[PDB]
């Protein structure tokens, strides 16, 4: 292969999944692929015989700043600001020694990084290497990030200012003030990171969005105005699932059980790769699921429940014939199964987009960050699910589950989910928004060394 692309993911499941989907799509279009990855949270390189992996930044002996960071729980994310602040010299060395070792017939077209690796723009510039960015969250979230100076002036980023919570955000009516308060509760850290991510995204050679035009049409004018480089909207789950980049072992025994369920009769439940609840909330969720009287498949990550290794506070036999708990599944393959009638999600963007791409309507909870904005946009603009926006109450959980899966009152939500899947499929046909985004992206990358 004449042309090589280097990709550099953020080493968490919601970041590795889209960049290895993109890597596969670009491999399919005839590019050779090198992945730069931390040893931390590495995927199974044996699943990618067609890719070269290079492990960087946390090789032994480890830096003072990274050596003792926890490997699980939300605190593991401290690696993101630390690598941005201290990784530039090592990334430049690794890019240089790859380009020095390269064959004379092959050249590196570009570096594609996660948008959160804002430090990589200056490194790529210093080597006369073009950098493209992969956005792993929505255009709507980007629109909110660019509006932060206005949210700040209005006092929405003040945790102590508990006024106007149920009102429409001034200058941003698609959001309630409480959505902004939730999304930016970690304002001391996010203020600096998001400003840098925006500046270095605007400075990049091109922005790839894991989305499609018909999903986020209201947000296109903002990205065309804010980002001078070309934007490409490609819905990666419509190209392939992320099964090969799983960081955990799949429980595949779930498919034999799904095959025993009537069509659209199962609630799939998963609150993410990082999320945590109190025992009080975890038992309130469990009661809501039982109160619903619907069949369910619930992925609970070890550490989801504060105080327990897994699901110890749950009684044996509880959940009935109706319910299964597992540690991990191939989630998009589960969403594609005919048994699935709905998905109770934490509203992470990969989970939200996979559900949309499989036509599965949603019940939304959130654990902050971009989650409350995804839940608000999908529930109120697209109308493909119900937002549980006032915590965990067993009655409200039961009503939301029944509304989406059974109630005639919820038929419009099930129909909206069906039609949005169809729009995603049409977007991949010749002349479709996603087809044209991908053809343009391939032509654009092929032009970078002219
Ligand atoms: C930018 C980030 C800096 C970061 C550093 C660590 C920090 C925390 C977690 C804040 C609390 C304190 C502290 C110290 C901590 O508890 O560790 C802080 C904010 C979110 C974070 O990125 C988040 O890091 C997590 C690992 O700890 C990832 O698992 C998240 O990815 C996942 O990525 C998915 C794909 O983007 C996303 O939909 C999903 O919700 C998310 O859970 C990713 O979400 C990012 O949050 C940003 C918040 O503004 C968004 O702009 C980005 O689009 C989004 O990707 C991690
Ligand atoms: C370098 C390139 C990237 C590029 C990718 C396609 C892309 C867009 C046109 C920007 C807006 C979104 C998007 C997704 C868009 O509307 O794409 C349009 O979507 C229509 C269906 O709604 C199709 O009929 C059109 O052919 C297609 O251009 C973009 C910029 C300039 C551009 O050449 C093209
Ligand atoms: O049991 C599971 C649970 C989740 N996932 C995948 O983990 C990713 C989670 O990404 P998301 O953006 O939804 O949220 P995060 O977990 O990053 O907060 C998605 O690609 C899911 O399909 C999976 O494969 N199996």
UniProtKB/Swiss-Prot annotation:
Catalytic function, reaction form: steviolbioside + UDP-alpha-D-glucose = rebaudioside B + UDP + H(+); stevioside + UDP-alpha-D-glucose = rebaudioside A + UDP + H(+); rebaudioside E + UDP-alpha-D-glucose = rebaudioside D + UDP + H(+); rebaudioside D + UDP-alpha-D-glucose = rebaudioside M + UDP + H(+)
Designated name of the protein: UDP-glycosyltransferase 76G1
EC number: 2.4.1.-
Residue positions binding rubusoside: 15
Top EC group: transferase
Gene3D superfamilies (UniProt xref): Glycogen Phosphorylase B (3.40.50.2000)
pH dependence per the entry: Optimum pH is 7.0-8.5 with stevioside as substrate (at 40 degrees Celsius).
Stimuli inducing this protein: Induced by blue light and red:far-red light in a ratio of 1.22.
UniProt keywords, alphabetically: Transferase
Function according to Swiss-Prot or TrEMBL: Involved in the biosynthesis of steviol glycosides in leaves. Converts the di-glycoside steviolbioside to the tri-glycoside rebaudioside B. Converts the tri-glycoside stevioside to the tetra-glycoside rebaudioside A. Converts the tetra-glycoside rebaudioside E to the penta-glycoside rebaudioside D. Converts the penta-glycoside rebaudioside D to the hexa-glycoside rebaudioside M. Can glucosylate rubusoside and rebaudioside A in vitro.
Effect of residue 197 to W: Reduces catalytic efficiency 13-fold for stevioside
Keyword Ribosomal protein tagged: no
Thermal properties: Optimum temperature is 40 degrees Celsius with stevioside as substrate (at pH 7.0).
Biotechnological applications: Overexpression of UGT76G1 in Stevia leaves increases the rebaudioside A/stevioside ratio more than 5-fold without compromising plant development or changes in total steviol glycoside content. Rebaudioside A has the advantage to be sweeter and have less bitter aftertaste than stevioside.
Known outcome of mutating residue 135 to W: Reduces catalytic efficiency 780-fold for stevioside
Known outcome of mutating residue 190 to I: Reduces catalytic efficiency 4-fold for stevioside
Assembly behavior: Monomer.
Similarity comment: family membership: Belongs to the UDP-glycosyltransferase family.
GO molecular function: quercetin 3-O-glucosyltransferase activity; quercetin 7-O-glucosyltransferase activity; steviolbioside glucosyltransferase activity (rebaudioside B forming); stevioside glucosyltransferase activity (rebaudioside A forming); UDP-glucosyltransferase activity
Binding-site positions, UDP: 17, 273, 328-329, 346-354
Organism domain of life: Eukaryota
Residues bound to rebaudioside A: 15, 136-137, 145, 349, 370-371
Gene name linked to the record: UGT76G1
SUPFAM superfamilies noted in UniProt: UDP-Glycosyltransferase/glycogen phosphorylase
């Amino acid at each position: 292969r004449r042309r090589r692309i280097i990709l550099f993911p953020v080493p968490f499941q919601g970041h590795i999944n889209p960049i290895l989907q993109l890597a596969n799509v670009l491999y399919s279009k005839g590019f050779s692929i090198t992945i730069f990855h931390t040893n931390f949270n590495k995927p199974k390189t044996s699943n990618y015989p067609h890719f070269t992996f290079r492990f960087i930044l946390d090789n032994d002996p480890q830096d003072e700043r990274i050596s003792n960071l926890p490997t699980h729980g939300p605190l593991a994310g401290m690696r993101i600001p630390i690598i941005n602040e201290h990784g530039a010299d090592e990334l430049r060395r690794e890019l240089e020694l790859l380009m020095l070792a390269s064959e004379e017939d092959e050249e590196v077209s570009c570096l594609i990084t996660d948008a959160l690796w804002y430090f990589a723009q200056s490194v790529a510039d210093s080597l006369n290497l073009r950098r493209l960015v992969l956005m792993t969250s929505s255009l709507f979230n980007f629109h909110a990030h660019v509006s932060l100076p206005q949210f700040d002036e209005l006092g929405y980023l003040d945790p102590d200012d508990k006024t106007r919570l149920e009102e429409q955000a001034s200058g941003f009516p698609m959001l309630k003030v409480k959505d902004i308060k939730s999304a930016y509760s970690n304002w001391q850290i996010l203020k600096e990171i998001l400003g840098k991510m925006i500046k270095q995204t605007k400075a990049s050679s091109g922005v790839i969005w894991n989305s499609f035009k018909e999903l986020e049409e209201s947000e296109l004018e903002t990205v065309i105005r804010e980002i001078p480089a070309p934007s490409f909207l490609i819905p990666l789950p419509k190209h392939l699932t992320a099964s090969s980049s799983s960081l955990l072992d799949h429980d595949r025994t779930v498919f034999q059980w799904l095959d025993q369920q009537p069509p659209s009769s199962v609630l799939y439940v998963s609150f993410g790769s990082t999320s945590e609840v109190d025992e009080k909330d975890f038992l309130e969720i469990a009661r809501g699921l039982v109160d619903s009287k619907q069949s369910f498949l619930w992925v609970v990550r070890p550490g989801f429940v504060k105080g327990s290794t897994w699901v110890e506070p749950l009684p044996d036999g509880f959940l009935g014939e109706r319910g299964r708990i597992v540690k991990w599944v191939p989630q998009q393959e589960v969403l594609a199964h005919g048994a699935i009638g709905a998905f109770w999600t934490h509203s992470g963007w990969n989970s939200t987009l996979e559900s949309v791409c499989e036509g599965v309507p949603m019940i939304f909870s959130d654990f902050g960050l971009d989650q409350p904005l995804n839940a608000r946009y999908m529930s109120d603009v697209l109308k493909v699910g119900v937002y549980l926006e006032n915590g965990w109450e067993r009655g409200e959980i039961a009503n939301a589950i029944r509304r989406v899966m059974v109630d005639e009152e919820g038929e419009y939500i099930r129909q909206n989910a069906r039609v949005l899947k169809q729009k995603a499929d049409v977007s991949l046909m010749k002349g479709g928004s996603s087809y044209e985004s991908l053809e343009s992206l391939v032509s654009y990358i092929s032009s970078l060394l002219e």
